Symmetry: C2
Subunit: 368 residues, 2 copies
């Protein structure tokens, strides 16, 4: 087949993107007067761009950093690799389970060991971490993937305390999941509470902007930033100067911020339509983390197993994501599926959900 | 200050670039109909783009590979890092001395050890390699930096033989420096001779095209390519899909090839003007590797040391490159300076060289 509907958690609404503006800024940047942009710039990122990042992160997340603490790289994986090299071979990493598997996967190639920790309604299990001899804790405190959990303000304090207790300890705050929250109290970055230079902040222009441009940023505590600038002095940027300059302009003249607001509205509509439809099956489908992100988790009580649910959906030309993809515990029961609605066009949402539900043997409204 | 003249060996003629065409292809690619390009593509590279790479490499260098053996990454450094992880922690690397320091520097972060080998008129010292217990040999056979040496056809055969002798051995062929040769025999890739899946081929769109776009490629022997696709299945591309698509088009419709020819002419003129001027001081300045690349080496007999020469040049706002920057084995005397003329505009060449010569206490023709 070709797959018709792709319920990917990290997809964006591609049809909505401001092509005209982007093209405009491209036109302004890529031209004879800016010919010097064709040579390589600062490895760490263009100063202009690092500046906008620090501005953006302050407004949006409460992050406090200088431009000289911002490292720009081609995707989160590029930056974590540099981080692993930077912090050294002895560090032991604690990671969330379940969660995105990237961190564990990358660590398989590096000397460093890892330890998984549970996440619950209040975030990562700080009690276990404290007993465990990890040095660096990787966590998504703002909204855990996939369930949407927030790291409670107590645990934030406890974790920062843990980090303060030793010179070797750090926290990696992953905010890959960009700022589409609709419900709950809006709570800031853990980095914003950090007064001890303990938190490394990680994010990307993927769920905002454009995933395929591969533009990501890591914010280092100022000692690490100095060490970074020394260790990696001879490297080159892994992100196009042209693209940096373009995004710099897009941000400076306010269009990025307009984009974000416009998209927030669109995603809100989509999510609400999706919930509107799914809430009708409340006996056999339970939704988790419904008021955050571009995706939800369904617990499915069809007596169909996880694998069956995936295959049936794929047969209907709809790709859906088994939660076991994101888990080291091999038993997930009842079966859970992640659905993301970024790429599903707004006017086809009902049809798309219908397709999946139908393939799963649910009764479906007309026009699918 | 700002530096007025930057004699960087890897710089290109930025003023010459086809902005209009590039912008055209950008316009064609980045638009509502191609909205799916905004999601991430194949980690290894866009199939269209890998295809053009395989085509390009065949016509230009005689490289024989499938698109599925081409890995696209953000600069040579990104790809070598993946390579180091792929081949494992036990491998020992041999590297050229002198040369670009990137390889040594990267290796400092990985478990892997390295050994430098001399380069002469005929390329890397294969005799030493054979005695040495290295597993992977890094070399720039087409045109060594900075002197311009070519790996002789004997040594090519000897090195491939060396590689054939053991299951663990490989050769990294760097063709970062590939396109601008004017003199000597135009000679093919070592990869083209490889029939034993021993050569990893490495190149980039920097000296052609645009350095700052950070688009590079590594061509893996087919067993390694299969291992790569498995080991790194979960990675994402480090190069923008949009930029891939743009360059894909630029290549397909022949604009890349036009670009290359146009640039070859320009660089040739610049080099010839530079030689024309410098040949006048043949007693105190000797030129090396003069008929290759976007740069030359000067041996300077001023009794000024290397450092002095650099500083004097920088005073008067010209940046020049000490050859010691490129060596692991012992201080060079008499001083050598690398001058690259990629970025120096054609109509300012005389002025620029004059600036440097003047600062070094030489007499200047035209006042
Ligand atoms: Ca490991
Ligand atoms: Ca959710
Ligand atoms: Ca090493
Ligand atoms: Ca890139
Ligand atoms: Cl063709
Ligand atoms: Cl110097």
């Amino acid at each position: 087949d070709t797959i018709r509907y792709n319920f990917h958690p990290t997809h964006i609404d591609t049809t909505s993107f401001p092509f005209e503006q982007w093209r405009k800024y491209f036109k302004q940047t890529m031209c004879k007067e800016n010919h010097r942009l064709l040579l390589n710039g600062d490895h760490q990122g263009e100063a202009s761009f690092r500046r906008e990042i620090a501005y953006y992160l302050h407004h949006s997340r409460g992050v406090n950093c200088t431009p000289e603490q911002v490292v720009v790289g081609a995707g989160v994986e590029t930056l974590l690799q540099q981080l692993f090299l930077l912090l050294g071979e002895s560090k032991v990493y604690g990671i969330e389970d379940p969660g995105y598997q990237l961190m564990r996967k990358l660590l398989s190639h590096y000397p460093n060991d890892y330890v998984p920790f549970q996440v619950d309604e209040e975030g990562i299990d700080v009690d276990s971490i404290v007993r465990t001899a990890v040095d660096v804790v990787y966590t998504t405190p703002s909204r855990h993937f996939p369930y949407g959990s927030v790291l409670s303000i107590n645990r934030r304090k406890q974790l920062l305390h843990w980090a303060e207790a030793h010179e070797n300890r750090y926290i990696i705050e992953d905010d890959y999941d960009s700022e589409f929250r609709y419900t709950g109290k809006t709570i800031p970055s853990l980095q914003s509470m950090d007064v001890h230079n303990k938190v490394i902040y990680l994010g990307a222009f993927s769920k905002s902007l454009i995933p395929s441009v591969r533009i990501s940023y890591m914010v280092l505590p100022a000692p690490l930033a100095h060490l970074y600038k020394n260790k990696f002095s001879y490297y080159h940027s892994t992100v196009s100067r042209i693209d940096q300059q373009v995004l710099t302009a897009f941000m400076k003249q306010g269009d990025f911020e307009k984009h974000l607001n416009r998209m927030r509205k669109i995603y809100r509509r989509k999510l609400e339509k999706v919930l509107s439809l799914l809430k009708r099956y409340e006996d056999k489908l339970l939704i988790i983390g419904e008021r955050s992100g571009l995706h939800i988790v369904l617990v499915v009580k069809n007596g169909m197993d996880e694998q069956t649910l995936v295959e049936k959906a794929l047969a209907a030309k709809a790709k859906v994501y088994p939660l076991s993809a994101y888990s080291l515990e091999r038993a997930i029961h009842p079966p859970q599926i992640v659905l993301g609605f970024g790429s599903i066009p707004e006017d086809e949402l009902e049809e798309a959900i219908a397709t999946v539900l139908n393939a799963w043997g649910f009764l479906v409204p007309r026009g699918s």
